[PDB]
Amino acid sequence: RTMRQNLQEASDVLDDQIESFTKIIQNHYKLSPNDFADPTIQSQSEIYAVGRIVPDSPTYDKFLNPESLSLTSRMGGVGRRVRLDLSQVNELSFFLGQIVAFKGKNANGDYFTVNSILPLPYPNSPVSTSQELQEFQASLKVIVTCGPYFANDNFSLELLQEFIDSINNEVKPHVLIMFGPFIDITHPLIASGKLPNFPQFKTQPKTLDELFLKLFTPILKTISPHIQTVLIPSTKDAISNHAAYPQASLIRKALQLPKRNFKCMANPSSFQINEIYFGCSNVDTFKDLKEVIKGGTTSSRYRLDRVSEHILQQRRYYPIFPGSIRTHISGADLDVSYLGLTEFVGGFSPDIMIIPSELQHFARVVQNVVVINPGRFIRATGNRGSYAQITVQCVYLHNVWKRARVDLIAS
Amino acid sequence: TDTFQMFWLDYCEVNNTLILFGKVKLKDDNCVSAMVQINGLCRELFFLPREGKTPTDIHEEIIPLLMDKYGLDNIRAKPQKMKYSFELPDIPSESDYLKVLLPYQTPKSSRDTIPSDLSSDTFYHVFGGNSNIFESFVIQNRIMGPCWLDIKGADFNSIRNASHCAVEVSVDKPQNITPTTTKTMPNLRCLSLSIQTLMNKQEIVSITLSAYRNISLDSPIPENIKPDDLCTLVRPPQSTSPGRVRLFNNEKAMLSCFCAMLKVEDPDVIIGHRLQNVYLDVLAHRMHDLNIPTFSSIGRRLRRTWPEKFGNMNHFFISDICSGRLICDIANEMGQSLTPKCQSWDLSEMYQVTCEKEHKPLDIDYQNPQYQNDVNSMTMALQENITNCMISAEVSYRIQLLTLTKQLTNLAGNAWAQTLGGTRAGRNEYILLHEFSRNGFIVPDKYVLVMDFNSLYPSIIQEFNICFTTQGVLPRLLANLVDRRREVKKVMKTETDPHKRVQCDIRQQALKLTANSMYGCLGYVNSRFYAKPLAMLVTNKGREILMNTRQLAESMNLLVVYGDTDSVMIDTGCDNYADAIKIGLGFKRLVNERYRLLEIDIDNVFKKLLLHAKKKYAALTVNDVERFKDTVTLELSCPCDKRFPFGGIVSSNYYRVSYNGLQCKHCEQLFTPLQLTSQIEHSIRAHISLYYAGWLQCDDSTCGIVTRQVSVFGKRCLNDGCTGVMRYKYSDKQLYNQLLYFDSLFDCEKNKKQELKPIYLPDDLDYPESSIKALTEQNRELMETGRSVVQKYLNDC
Amino acid sequence: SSSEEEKKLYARLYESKLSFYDLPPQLEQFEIWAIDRLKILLEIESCLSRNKSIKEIETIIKPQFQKLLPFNTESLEDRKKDYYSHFILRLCFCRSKELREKFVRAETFLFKIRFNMLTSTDQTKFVQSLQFISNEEKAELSHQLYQTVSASKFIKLPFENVIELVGNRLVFLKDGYAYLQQLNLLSNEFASKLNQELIKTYQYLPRLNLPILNHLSSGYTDEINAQSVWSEEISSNYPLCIKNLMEGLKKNHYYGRQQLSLFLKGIGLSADEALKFWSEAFTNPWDCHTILSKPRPGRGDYHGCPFRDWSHERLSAELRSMKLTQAQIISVLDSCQKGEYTIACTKVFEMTHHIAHPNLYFERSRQLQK
Amino acid sequence: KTNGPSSSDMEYYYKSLYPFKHIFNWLNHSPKPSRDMINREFAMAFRSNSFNSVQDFKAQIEKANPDRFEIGAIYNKPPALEKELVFDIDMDDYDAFRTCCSGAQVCSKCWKFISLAMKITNTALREDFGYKDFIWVFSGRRGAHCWVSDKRARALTDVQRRNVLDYVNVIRDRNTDKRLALKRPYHPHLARSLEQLKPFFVSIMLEEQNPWEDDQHAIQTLLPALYDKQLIDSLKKYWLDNPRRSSKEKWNDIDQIATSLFKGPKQDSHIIKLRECKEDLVLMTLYPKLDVEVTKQTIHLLKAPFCIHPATGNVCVPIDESFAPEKAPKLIDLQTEMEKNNDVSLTALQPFINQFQAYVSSLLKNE
Ligand code: SF4
């Protein structure tokens, strides 16, 4: 796929999100489609409605509140948007791009009064047969890191070397998952072109791709062949030529990394290590999701729990739309036409969900899903960052949350 | 021996019938007047089938509908293949039509005609809807001007007190009337009228009537023929107080006697000078003003009352009322066309020109008081009237106004009255109507020498086969006319009898005039057969021939003094009649050698010529650029930090591409390749990121909002009710162009050819071949490596 | 029908990516789906009338399939769109013999293209959803079969099913049988069946008695003077675009009218003569940069630049008729390949006697005779 | 000038001799009158239609007394659905290769061109198309008409008739001033036809007709069949220096001069190419030269069997393997036989009626 943006196709995808949730709600709560009607027009009767949370003006203030939100699909209400009256609802958390289901009424034509919120149901968890679990049996250690890997004012990978020595000779994990950026295109020396002569290279790199081959490849090559290593990019990776989410995987041969133990995965990607389902995505949902909140009970909860539940409910790793912007320098860079690929593969909730963030590292169980932010491997100043270690005790529900221990370790 | 035989002269239309006026022979070999009322005439309509439809389909639709509107029991109709070759664009060359015979006399709505653009799903055009009844009769029965008519089934008891004629009959159907071949005609009763008026309203003071009761057009009319009767009527101009003179106490009494005399005389032809559009009008209105009950005797149909609207239409009413008697006006358009040597066409002038006799005209003014008490003045004034009356007659006979017009009428197939009182158009019209209709065509709905070039256009039409159909109909018609004219001239050379010879000369003249008038058919703007493409075609060829006629004249060392399509004047260069005529004939032969059908002749011989204009003279006569227009510059920063746009190997106050690379002019430090390419790549990625921010903009200039919100109908604007279209504000065309621009900066061939876009306008404060060639090859490697960084993203796009 | 019974019917009707449209399907969708199929069929007919090769037609229609009528998708909606559009066009084209023959021809050609775009596995499955000869019969006929096929398993069929291969001597004939072409047999069966079904559809149409069906059926439907512009003396001075526009106007009686009208004004055709010219031609000025900027001509269009718009095959035939040598033609085509249309046109001017305006081409051609 | 038959001779012929019953039974494809006859077109050509029975057919032809009539298609209504597949072969396209006859003459020598044309066409109709029910009929002068009456042949569309014609019509370009340059390798039909014609080429072309003994004729029709200009120019010089060499000598000179000219590693390519040119010339001279128009359309009219030829008086009889044009009975000779024996069964026409009857009996059995 090329760099094309097609408005009809983008709009198709946004329409389909509303429609597919309409079917999930109808099956879960066992409602008939005749119970759903168009909330954008007046009725005498209470109705069920499903739609996307949007601002009530298309040119809107940075800071939203419960009085400045609107909610339809093309079939549901000819795509019309209707202001939300949330005054009869004491507890809520909404965000722009959220798909939601309501019970309510448009009494007079110009507002839809929400009487209750029908919570979206949590997706199912993967299962395994007894045979498969016995093979896996015949503890599991997974290490997870996330870039940047060098500081803002130099090109030292000394900390990464120290780390590699540690995993090779002490920790000895089965798998290492490394998230980009590796060479971050917004690194301030890279951005300004203040790139020095490297006396430890016989021939100087002429491009950022060559800088990766001379700087990272030789150090990555030293990771033990016994440790399978997975690379997942960022849209800030200079080495990627696909700078939109969802992002195609890097090409391992081009990075001159050995087949013996390196796999390049897409951003996002989902995979199993033994029975454990991982869902990995490298856009900072945890930083970006700005909730509009009402209620003492909702506000007293931890933000990271609420945000993880929104992601599980929305069944996509970056449900915010329009995606966030850094102001132009960088952003989520959503390729809206392919948001399909960012949905939970198979409709399954992952056992472990890893979504690196610039917020402080964390590991939390939410709705029986282990949610992990390993933090940045090095800090901008050059001080130690962090990484995550996952140790898991060796049809059936994996109950990874009951068997997994996650440590957040100073790198 | 069992059929009614009449020589027809004129006609009139009334109550959807056609009346013919003419003469019948009696047992004593004398001829009296007669009228024939013709019933049963129909309009010939042709309905043009639609694509896929047939005439039978048409028959099914309109015939029943026509039976209703007109209230007819049955309507004769049948399929018929007809050809079309005129100016209506959507009609084919040939088609099967439905020919419908719609009677003029119908029980209902007889005055309502079927329009050509009648709405229907079976046909899309209708010809013949507005057919004139005289036209229908003449064309259907192949009547060619005044002639003898065999009339069978003549009803002698149907018509009662309808006319001023001696014999009145009728017929139920026009097919009962056929033309005979008899070439002779009966003598005509001619009555010369001369009227003296008075300006109060124009009022009539006196009338002179000179009767010639045996004018034979079959033999030349003897010069100075004397009238069988001469009478003058007069009323007093102020108060109440040769040949016969009759006095009346007032004008009403006078005009009453006039009408009575007209009835008894029963003339076939009324001769006069300026009758048509001067004196007949005065005569008519005065009979109207004074309520003369017998006013209709000026014609041959009897009416007790005038038309309702009587009091442009005045011309028709009078012409209609006169129907039955031919108006022989020597000074109307026809009369003038036979007397081109005149200039005013005043009576005395015409008399001089045509008869070589002098008459000094008295200016009679009856307003003058002397005419109420001075008997000698009154008598001299009446003498003037009598003289004018007999002069008018004599002139009309000398210029052969009747025979020529008759021959013209027989050739064109129109009415004698129309030839006498109309323009050329009428003849031009009917000659074609007869010609086309007979060959299955549908016609449209209603010394200096003066050389004669009148035959120019008719020779062009014949030579180049120019016709509505294109040998075509028009050229063939002309060829026949020219051929017959030769046949006549051949017979003349041999003919000994002066009578037959004079007759031949009349025939020959008529044939000539007919041919030389044919151009009017297609050239006259208001012609029924007008065709601009043909007119222009004939006109252009006419210019060429005339232009080349000039060159020909000069090739004989002659000088063209003047020229036009009708005539060309040539200076012979001689001072002798003989030498002049020989030059003239030599030129005649030369012109014909180059144009076989163009036969010019010598019309005028000028021994001397004082010339000012054609009719003004005295003489002695003898007898990538646009693609990048909105891209933005690549901005580089020096690893001293000065920022500047990079425009390739081009001039700049900020940087220099030297033999060892890109150099900063502020601090002299050289960029390394990585220092350049990291910045190229960083800009690219900034652009690609902006592009993926997905800003949208609205079309509508009165709205224009920019937003990142996308409606589930993408193109639809989110402003309540706004009808504008939404478009990605960084289109993928713009992105691609931006990258292609970056690519161009590091393209060696483009750098060397100096085809890059300038980074600076001339008024910019920072405004800055063989050096570029050299420097580009010296930096090839740097360029190609810079270029590869752009290509990383261009193949991915 | 519950949405599940309808899905099971369409799963059974479309076990193959191709269909003979044997069973009937069980207003905006009706019109759009009919219009979208109709556009593809008109593009097929436009390419057939231009004598394009099957491979060129396949290349032109491939992007139209992705846009208007996706083939080879697992989407139930695209499969529905293909069925319903076919049956909706049966209602449109059943009315006249000419409309049926045009529809059967275009639709049978559409079937051929789609069959060729299938995988060999999908073709075999579709044929399963033509008797091979024995190895003994192959051994007996081996010499005659090899001689026939050399220039180009065996299937034995009546020769009447492969008349096109018989005419070219591409198949061996014995005792009224041809030894082979399967696509031509399937296409003839499809065409025959479709023609029978259109006749049946027409017999039932009076019960269905409309605006959309009528509209869709109708959607298939001076030295320099008005005469001299058609003459060789004047026309020998025209560049190829004006030649193309002309030949068209004569053959068929917006952009082309504008390009030609303004060119003729530029050569001196008066307003009055131009109105005569157009009225007479309808029997039933831009420079090259401007001409090239207009939307590209499609089937039935004659505007644009032949050096860009025509195939090298068509240009070569035109240039050969102009007496150009093979070396001259290669030089012109090299310029065309480079996108240097005005250079190609300048070369044609020079070889038949830099120009970048049709009126300058005409004026220069006239100046050479004055 | 032997005048053709008089109008009274034609009246006598249709009254007493013409085999109306056999022609009706042939065209009707049944013993009982059917639509194959009632709806069949006939055209009549006069010295200046459809039929319901043998009696109606006889009575209308006797009343009309045409110089010939022509058989057309079976229609859906009484005067196209079906017609016999037909071929016409005339001598005209062989005139450039015969010396035994000039203009519109024919004899048993040049009749061998038509005999070979019938043999090659019959091989294709039988072996390649599987047709069983066909008959050849003398055209009454110097050609022959084939009528293929198999149900499958009768029902052919104009497209299928054109494909059958294009299969059998190998010699599309009849111009003898040019090399045919036929497609290689030969199609199996063309290879088989060459092997069938080769044995007759020496005896017919090189010996009996000997058309290339004339050096101008050899330059006009033998030399243009060769591919190589140096060979053509060398042979032309050699025959100018050695005039009036027989066709057989000139045929051998081609190989001798070619062997002298074409030496070294490329010689085998020239030998193959010369053999191909000689093979193309065997086909140019002896292969069937069909009239292409009569075969293409179901509606084409063709002269009925047993018509009289208006210039020769010959009956258009069925052809067997023994037939030559001199064996065709003339109407005047048949009238002279009938004066002695007033019964058609005692005339020279009866063997040809018996042959045609046996054909019709076979056809009706197959139907
Ligand atoms: S290059 Fe210009 S003048 Fe020549 S054919 Fe193309 S558009 Fe016409």
Q: What is the 3-state secondary structure (H, E, C) of D77-105?
A: CCCCCECCEEEEECCHHHHHHCCCCCCCC
Pairwise CA distance, residues C216 & B555, whole Å: 71
The answer to whether B786 touches B794, Cβ cutoff 8 Å, is no
Give the Cα separation of B610 and A200 in Å (integer): 117
Distance linking the first and last C-alpha atoms of chain B: 107
Nearest-CA residue for ligand 1 atom 2 is C288
Q: Which of B685, B666, B662, B690 is nearest to B746 (CA)?
A: B662
Per-residue buried b or exposed e for D19-46, using 16+ beta carbons within 10 Å of the residue's own CB? bbebbbbbbbbeeebebbbbbbbbbeee
Residues B613 and B677 in one domain: no
B784 touches chain A (CB under 8 A): no
Residue B706 lies in a domain: no
CA distance B281 to D119: 101
Tokens of B194: 């001369």
Residue C126's contacts (CB-CB under 8 Å, 6 or more residues apart) are C16, C17, C18, C115, C118
Closest ligand 1 atom to Cα of C242: 8
Q: Is C208 on the interface with D (CB under 8 A)?
A: no
Q: Give me D157's structure tokens.
A: 């569309």
How far apart are the C-alpha atoms of B300 and B268, rounded to whole Å? 9
Q: Which of B597, B317, B601, B343 is nearest to B475 (CA)?
A: B597
Query: Does ligand 1 lie within 6 Å of residue C342's CB atom?
Result: yes
Report the alpha-carbon distance of residue D283 to residue D275 in Å, rounded: 13
CA distance A138 to A130: 12
Angstrom distance (rounded) from CA B175 to CA B155 = 15
* Distance (Å) of CA D14 to CA A250, C41, D38, D131: 97, 59, 20, 32
Neighbours of A91 (CB within 10 A): 12
Number of C-alpha atoms within 13 angstroms, CB side, residue B398?
19
SS3 A22: helix
Kindly state if the Cβ of C305 falls inside 6 Å of ligand 1: yes
Q: How far is the C-alpha of B675 from the C-alpha of B655, rounded, in Å?
A: 14
Q: What is the spatial distance between Cα C284 and Cα B257, in angstroms, rounded to a whole number? A: 67
- Reduce the DSSP state of residue B706 to 3 states and report it: strand
Residue A410 backbone dihedrals phi, psi, to 5 degrees: -65, 130
Q: Does B675 lie at the interface with A, CB-CB under 8 angstroms?
A: yes
Q: Is residue B707 part of a domain?
A: no
Cite the DSSP H helix spans in B269-415. Answer: 280-289, 313-322, 333-337, 347-355, 370-373, 375-398, 401-412
Q: Measure the CA dihedral B503/B504/B505/B511, to 10°.
A: 110
CA atoms within 13 A on the CB side of A225: 3
Q: What is the C-alpha to C-alpha distance for residues C270 and C268, in angstroms, rounded to an integer? A: 6
| Separation of CA A237 from chain center | 17
Domain boundary among B154, B186, B218: B186
Do residue B37 and residue B133 come from a single domain?
yes
Chain C nearest-CA distance from D213, in A, is: 37
- The three-state secondary structure class of B445 is coil
Burial label, D219 (beta-carbon count in 10 A; 0-12, 13-18, 19+): middle
Closest to D144 (Cα-Cα) out of D128, D120, D124, D164: D120
Same domain, B108 and B225: no
Q: Which residues from chain D sit within 8 angstroms of residue C151, using beta carbons?
A: 183, 185
Nearest by CB to residue A185, choosing from B681, B712, B736, is: B681
Place of tokens 């303004």: C262
> What is the gyration radius of the CA atoms in chain C, in angstroms?
26
Q: Which two tokens stand for residue D358?
A: 């046996």
Of the candidates B113, B144, B97, the residue with the CA atom closest to the CA atom of residue B42 = B113
- Decide if B294 contacts B260 (C-beta within 8 A): yes
Q: Are C108 and C195 in contact (CB under 8 A)?
A: no
- Can you give the length of chain A in residues? 411
Q: Are residues B288 and B385 in the same domain?
A: yes
Spatial contact of B316 and B323, defined as CB atoms under 8 Å apart: no
**Closest to B120 measured CA to CA, from B44, B45, B57:** B57
How many angstroms separate the CA atoms of A119 and A100, rounded?
8
Q: Which atom of ligand 1 is nearest to the CA of C308?
A: 6
| Burial class for D132, CB neighbours closer than 10 Å (0-12, 13-18, 19+) | middle
Query: Are A260 and A53 within 8 A, CB to CB?
Result: no
C-alpha distance from residue A134 to each of A130, A131, A274, B213, C66 (Å): 6, 5, 10, 146, 47
CB A108 within 8 A of CB A93: no
Q: Which residues of D are catalytic?
A: 41, 88, 90
Does C181 touch chain D if contact means CB atoms closer than 8 Å? no
What's the token pair of residue A24? 């999930």
Q: Are B675 and B637 in contact (CB under 8 A)?
A: no
The answer to whether the beta carbons of residues A6 and B726 sit under 8 Å apart is: no
Indicate whether B35 and B102 sit together in one domain: yes
Q: Is the CB of C285 under 6 A from ligand 1?
A: no
B364 and B491: one domain? no
Residue C275, CA distances (Å) to B525, C233, C251, C283 in order: 19, 21, 19, 13
Residues of C in contact with D183 (CB under 8 A): 151, 169
B374 in helix, strand or coil?
Answer: coil
Question: How many angstroms is it from B625 CA to the middle of ligand 1?
Answer: 21
Beta carbons of B364 and B384 less than 8 angstroms apart: yes
Ligand 1 mean position, distance from CA C263 (Å): 11
| 3 state DSSP class of B568 | strand
Q: Which of residues B579, B596, B621 is at a domain's end? A: B621
Residue B316 lies in a domain: yes
| Resolution in units of Å | 5.6
Q: Is residue C295 within 8 Å of residue C308, measured between CB atoms?
A: no
Structure tokens at A174: 């089965």
**Final residue of a structural domain among B567, B595, B621:** B621
Listed in sequence order, the residues at least 6 apart from B185 whose beta carbon sits closer than 8 Å to its beta carbon are B7, B146, B148, B217, B218
Closest Cα in chain A to B789: A207
Which residue in the block uniquely carries the two structure tokens 């489609």?
Answer: A33
Please choose, from the candidates B670, B675, B677, B648, the residue with its C-alpha nearest in 3D space to the C-alpha of residue B768. Answer: B648
Q: Are residues B339 and B376 in the same domain?
A: yes
Q: Does one domain contain both B111 and B58?
A: yes
Indicate whether residue C332 lines ligand 1 (CB < 6 A): no
Residue B660's domain spans which residues? 634-694+730-794
Nearest CA-CA partner of A237 in A262, A265, A209, A257: A209
| CB burial string C77-102: b at 16+ within 10 A, e below | eebbbbbbbbbbbbbbbbbeeebbeb
Q: Tokens representing C177?
A: 């049988």
Residues 6+ apart with CB under 8 A from B188: B215, B216, B217, B268, B269, B402
Cis ω before A246 (30° cut-off from 0): yes
B642 touches A at CB < 8 Å: no
Quote the CA–CA distance of B504 and B490 in Å, as a whole number. Answer: 10
Measured between beta carbons, which residues in chain C are less than 8 angstroms from residue D189?
A: 169, 173
Q: Do residues C364 and C268 make contact, with C-beta atoms less than 8 angstroms apart?
A: no
The experimental technique used to determine this model is cryo-EM
Please name every residue paired with B38 in a beta bridge, in sequence order, or none if there are none. Answer: B18, B171
Dist CA B157 CA B1 (whole Å): 20
Separation of alpha carbons D352 and D316, rounded Å: 10
* Contact residues on chain A for B709, CB-CB shorter than 8 A: 54-55, 58, 322
Same domain, B478 and B382: no
For B59, the 3-state DSSP assignment is helix
Contact assessment for residue B367 and residue B381, using Cβ atoms and an 8 Å cutoff: no
* DSSP-assigned beta bridge partners for residue B194: B208
Cβ–Cβ < 8 Å for B179, B434? no
State phi, psi for B703 to the nearest 5 degrees: -145, -75
**Contacts for C11-18 with beta carbons within 8 Å, 24 or more apart?**
C13/C83, C14/C79, C15/C125, C15/C129, C16/C122, C16/C125, C16/C126, C16/C129, C17/C71, C17/C72, C17/C114, C17/C118, C17/C122, C17/C126, C18/C111, C18/C114, C18/C115, C18/C118, C18/C122, C18/C126
Q: Using the mean position of ligand 1's atoms as its centre, give its distance from the Cα of residue C344 in Å.
A: 9
The helix/strand/coil state of B109 is coil
Closest alpha carbon to B779 in B654, B657, B636, B637: B657
Short-list B790, B778, B695, CA closest to B737: B790
Pull the structure tokens for residue A315.
């069944």
Residue B692: CB atoms within 10 Å: 24
Q: Which of C267, C288, C319 to mutate to test the pocket of ligand 1 (most atoms within 8 A of CB)?
A: C288
Query: What's the DSSP call for residue B603?
Result: E
Alpha carbon distance A251, A258 (integer Å): 12
Which residues in chain A touch residue B675, judged by CB atoms under 8 angstroms apart? Answer: 193-195
Residue D191 has its nearest CB partner, among C147, C173, C175, at C147
Say how far apart CA A123 and CA A312 lie, in whole Å: 7
Q: How far is CA C224 from the centre of its chain?
A: 36
Residue D148 near residue C148 (C-beta atoms within 8 A): no
- Residues B32, B101, single domain; the answer is yes
- How deeply is C154 buried, as exposed, middle or buried, from its count of CB atoms within 10 A (0-12, 13-18, 19+)? middle
CB-defined contacts A:B, below 8 A: 146
Residue B353 domain-assigned (yes or no): yes
D109 sits in which H/E element:
helix D108-123
B22 with B155, same domain: the answer is yes
Q: Is residue B44 assigned to a domain?
A: yes
CA dist C228 and A385 (Å) reads 88
Asked if D152 is an interface residue toward chain C (Cβ–Cβ < 8 A), one would say yes
Terminus-to-terminus CA distance in chain A, angstroms?
37
Residues shown for chain B: 797
Given a contact cutoff of 8 angstroms between Cβ atoms, the answer to whether D105 and D115 are in contact is no
Say if ligand 1 is within 6 A of residue C103 CB: no
Residue showing tokens 């294009």: D166
Strands (E), B480-615: 559-563, 567-571, 601-613
Q: Do A243 and B785 touch (CB under 8 A)?
A: no
- Exposure letters B304-323 (e unless 16+ CB within 10 A, then b): eebeeebeeeeeebbbbbbb
Mark yes or no for CB contact C175/D185 under 8 Å.
Answer: no
Please indicate, yes or no, if residue B711 is contained in any of the structural domains.
no
At B165 the three-state DSSP class reads coil
Cβ-based neighbours of B788, under 8 Å, separated by 6 or more:
A207
Closest protein CA for atom 6 of ligand 1: C305
Examine residue B265 and state whether it is found in any structural domain, yes or no: yes
- Asked if the Cβ–Cβ distance from B639 to A194 is below 8 Å, we say yes
Strands B244-247 and B229-234: parallel
Distance of alpha carbon C239 from alpha carbon C348, whole angstroms: 9
C163 touches chain D (CB under 8 A): yes
- The tally of domains found in chain B comes to 4
Ligand 1 contact via C239 beta carbon (within 6 Å):
yes
B216 touches B23 (CB < 8 A) = no
Q: Can you say whether the dihedral through the CA atoms of D349, D350, D351, D354 is positive or negative?
A: positive
| Chain A hits for B634, Cβ within 8 Å | none
Give Cα separations from C2 to C6, C7, C8, D91, D348 (angstroms).
Answer: 6, 9, 10, 76, 85
Structure tokens at C173: 């004939």
- Tokens in use for C6? 């309808």
Question: Does residue B582 sit within a domain?
Answer: yes
Instruction: Supply φ then ψ for residue C157, to 5 degrees.
Output: -140, 155
Query: Are B380 and B499 contained in the same domain?
Result: no
Token reading at B697? 């903009």
Burial A320-340 (b: 16+ CB within 10 A, else e): bbbbbbeeeebbbbbbbbbbe
User: By alpha-carbon position, which residue is closest to atom 3 of ligand 1?
Assistant: C358
Measured distance CA(D8)–CA(B264) in Å, rounded: 81
How far apart, in whole angstroms, are the C-alpha atoms of residue A324 and residue A346? 27
Distances (CA, A) of A170 to A164, A173, A410, C346: 10, 9, 15, 78
Contacts of A377 (CB under 8 A, 6+ apart): A145, A146, A147, A148, A149, A159, A160, A163, A385, A386, A387, A411
Distance from CA of A300 to the nearest CA of B (A): 31
Tokens of B524: 């006259």
A382: region left, alpha or beta (phi > 0 left; psi from -120 to 50 alpha): left
C63 at interface of D, judged by CB pairs closer than 8 A: no
State the DSSP H helix or E strand holding residue C346, giving kind and residue range, or none if neither.
helix C341-352
d(CA B5, CA D7): 56
Q: Does C277 sit in the ligand 1 pocket, CB within 6 Å?
A: no
Helix (H, G, I), strand (E, B) or coil at A391: strand
Q: Please judge whether D129 and C160 are an interchain contact, meaning their C-beta atoms are less than 8 angstroms apart.
A: no
- State the closest ligand 1 atom to the C-alpha of C305, by its place in the atom list counted from 1: 6
Angle between the N-to-C axes of helices A208-215 and B673-693, in degrees from 0 to 180, rounded to the nearest 10: 110
> What residues are paired with B635 via a beta bridge?
B645
Q: Compute φ and ψ for D161, nearest 5 degrees.
A: -60, -45
Tokens of residue B283, six digits: 């005569």
